[PDB]
Amino acid sequence: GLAVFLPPYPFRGLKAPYLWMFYKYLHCATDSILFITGEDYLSVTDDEAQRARWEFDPASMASLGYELPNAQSMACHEYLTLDNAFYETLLSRHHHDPIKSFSAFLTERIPDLETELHALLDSKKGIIDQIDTFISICNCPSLEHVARTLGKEVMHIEIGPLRAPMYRNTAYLDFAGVNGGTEASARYEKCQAEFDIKASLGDLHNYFLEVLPPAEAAGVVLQVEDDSNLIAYNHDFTNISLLSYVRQRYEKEDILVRAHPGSLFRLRDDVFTIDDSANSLAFINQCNEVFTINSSVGLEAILTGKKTTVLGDCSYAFINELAGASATVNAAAFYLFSYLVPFDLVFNQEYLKFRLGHPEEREIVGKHIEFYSAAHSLSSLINEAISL
Amino acid sequence: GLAVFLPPYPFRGLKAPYLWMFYKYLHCATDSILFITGEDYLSVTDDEAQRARWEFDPASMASLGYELPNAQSMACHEYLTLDNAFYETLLSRHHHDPIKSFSAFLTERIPDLETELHALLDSKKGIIDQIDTFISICNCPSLEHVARTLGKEVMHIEIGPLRAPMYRNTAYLDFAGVNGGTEASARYEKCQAEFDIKASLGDLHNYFLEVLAAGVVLQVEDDSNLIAYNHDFTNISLLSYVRQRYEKEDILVRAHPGSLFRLRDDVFTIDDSANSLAFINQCNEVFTINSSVGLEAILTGKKTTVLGDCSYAFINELAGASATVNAAAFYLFSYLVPFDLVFNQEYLKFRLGHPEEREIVGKHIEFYSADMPQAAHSLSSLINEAISLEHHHH
Numbered sequence A: 001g002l003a004v005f006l007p008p009y010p011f012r013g014l015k016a017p018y019l020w021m022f023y024k025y026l027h028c029a030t031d032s033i034l035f036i037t038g039e040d041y042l043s044v045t046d047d048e049a050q051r052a053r054w055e056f057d058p059a060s061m062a063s064l065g066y067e068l069p070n071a072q073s074m075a076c077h078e079y080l081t082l083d084n085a086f087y088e089t090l091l092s093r094h095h096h097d098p099i100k101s102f103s104a105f106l107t108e109r110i111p112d113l114e115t116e117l118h119a120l121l122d123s124k125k126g127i128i129d130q131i132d133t134f135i136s137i138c139n140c141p142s143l144e145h146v147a148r149t150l151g152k153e154v155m156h157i158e159i160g161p162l163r164a165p166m167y168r169n170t171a172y173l174d175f176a177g178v179n180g181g182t183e184a185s186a187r188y189e190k191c192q193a194e195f196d197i198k199a200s201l202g203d204l205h206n207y208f209l210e211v212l213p214p215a216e217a218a219g220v221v222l223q224v225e226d227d228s229n230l231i232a233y234n235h236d237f238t239n240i241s242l243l244s245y246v247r248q249r250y251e252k253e254d255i256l257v258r259a260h261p262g263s264l265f266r267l268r269d270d271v272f273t274i275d276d277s278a279n280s281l282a283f284i285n286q287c288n289e290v291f292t293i294n295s296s297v298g299l300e301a302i303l304t305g306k307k308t309t310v311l312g313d314c315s316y317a318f319i320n321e322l323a324g325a326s327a328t329v330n331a332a333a334f335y336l337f338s339y340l341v342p343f344d345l346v347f348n349q350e351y352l353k354f355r356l357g358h359p360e361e362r363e364i365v366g367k368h369i370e371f372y373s374a375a376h377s378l379s380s381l382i383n384e385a386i387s388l
Numbered sequence B: 001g002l003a004v005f006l007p008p009y010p011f012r013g014l015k016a017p018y019l020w021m022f023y024k025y026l027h028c029a030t031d032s033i034l035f036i037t038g039e040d041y042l043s044v045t046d047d048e049a050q051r052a053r054w055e056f057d058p059a060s061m062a063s064l065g066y067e068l069p070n071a072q073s074m075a076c077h078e079y080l081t082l083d084n085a086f087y088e089t090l091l092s093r094h095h096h097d098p099i100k101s102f103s104a105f106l107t108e109r110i111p112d113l114e115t116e117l118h119a120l121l122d123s124k125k126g127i128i129d130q131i132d133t134f135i136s137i138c139n140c141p142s143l144e145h146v147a148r149t150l151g152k153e154v155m156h157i158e159i160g161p162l163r164a165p166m167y168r169n170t171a172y173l174d175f176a177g178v179n180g181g182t183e184a185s186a187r188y189e190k191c192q193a194e195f196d197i198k199a200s201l202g203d204l205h206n207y208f209l210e211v212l213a214a215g216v217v218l219q220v221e222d223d224s225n226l227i228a229y230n231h232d233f234t235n236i237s238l239l240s241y242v243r244q245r246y247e248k249e250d251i252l253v254r255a256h257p258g259s260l261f262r263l264r265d266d267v268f269t270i271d272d273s274a275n276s277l278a279f280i281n282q283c284n285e286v287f288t289i290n291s292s293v294g295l296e297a298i299l300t301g302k303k304t305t306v307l308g309d310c311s312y313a314f315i316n317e318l319a320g321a322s323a324t325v326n327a328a329a330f331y332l333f334s335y336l337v338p339f340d341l342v343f344n345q346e347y348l349k350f351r352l353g354h355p356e357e358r359e360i361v362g363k364h365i366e367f368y369s370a371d372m373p374q375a376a377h378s379l380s381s382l383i384n385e386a387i388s389l390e391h392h393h394h
């Protein structure tokens, strides 16, 4: 059985922040799941005051592919609820800075949290013995240590870098960590010689493109300031120091900035030239090279053959650090077909069992292409796919 | 003789960043000054490409009270010029992170900089012998170490927390550090017994004044205050801090027009008051990292939370009306300096001899009153009389 970890701690000012994953696993569940979560996740569906949350938007339910759970759907699983008081305690140990508290939660072992997790799991020890793996939407060394004591692994699972409408929907699945401390590079290193791809980057990019590619400066990508990427996995770089970094190398009218609509702040009116392109691709094509901390837009540039500079930690960084025309295509082919997972599968318990048995990269790739579609060797599967 | 440290390194993307202090010292100088600075400081005045800078604006000139130097004014001093290329080197040592580089400069010793400082001072040993003190506009452990080694003291000088036209013009003068690592608290702890002020907090405020729910003050993102003296707090985490305690309905945000970024429209209630005071009176309590507005809030008797390091924080850490007043009185009259005086070589030589607090307060009140002497008044008596109400005669 699965144990899904969905912490209630409002680090970013939002209750039940990972509610969409709760709804998604509930909608896709076939067997009982152990949810390690908070009481807010259990009351929010019936909370008449949180009716305007984006998770309840019909467009979001359709985009992420779930429906709202009824009583039977929610009640037929197992629950362990994390104590509401631990958040305030964590805050007090970091000068009540919610951001710095979030960072510690993502990158450090927290004894109090491990203790509570142990106590919760011990209350249903018979249930825990049946657990096949732990699942987390974010890194959490506390949870990861606790899982090791039980001889269990933690699958880190998150929305992927390529998404609709532009691309096929993808997801992250990482045994080491998602976004930060990813295992993507280590995975490719072990199975590199199995990848001999007969294609260009355009061929790897168009297969995932679902829309007619746009027609044919220094690009700077801004991101949301208070997410895990810029709080913990940024190598101390920020939106400000990123702009400062590029400024050390370029003049103002040679710089095109791509703002993120979800950011708390935006650049003042007449400081930089702001891009107003219909999409990421239309922005990238106006640039000679692209600068980013760890935006997924950076992946898109690399896939289109644009010179990209990555200042933060991310899953696709190892691809860019390769000098070679064919060495890059092979690395990207692995990332796209073997590392990235079709979005729906990471919520499919049968697929998760498959990944849990530690299958060969060939089996993983074949399973993904099988999903994408409507040959035996790994390279032949990919080559045949991006030609048809 | 004075030595004034004006580094050329464009930590904030601005070359000759401390140009205004160069112009001010040149304007007020009576004797030869040793400027430890960069070539950019000497060429900017005659560089038409940079005439658009605020330092040349008539309003800014009259506000800070200086005029542009002619050939004689600039040439009659001693110069030691630092290599601009050290900035790029320092950058490379900090993962090309300009923020981390500036922070190191302000809070850490840098061996290469100490090497270059000593080598420059070695070129004019005879001149250095007659230097009494080093002056720095910012904290710099590299410079401070070099100076002490040569048996010189360091005065950290910067524009103050209270400024015209709202207030009397003030400046910082601190031997330990300016903004961060200040000696204001330690200094008061030593002389607090001499402060028995028989007046209100409002009297103190009104003396410096020349005009008359949850408040959050935003600051410039890349200045030294938010880079090094912030206790890891940012504009982002400051808003997070308050949101944890208050609903968005009860939050009022005072934006800083000098910032690189601005809040998106319909996220917070953005204040549009005419000034800081007008913003403060709309709040039950004010939250800040280390903005000068936080001082104004305390001076008006508003509850204030200070998350970062700054010179006035020790005032807030006291309980009691009498206690806060005696602390604020010290801060305003003894710690803060009349702006023009920190550029006056005689006053600086006066401070170098480390006089008693009464003498310092006496000097300051003399200036503020635009008088001249001395009297039998105690320190507190001077302050009490200076801020007390006196009726007109008839």
Ligand SMILES: [Cl-]
Pocket (backbone or CB within 6 Å): B220, B221, B226, B234, B235, B236
């Ligand atoms: Cl900030």
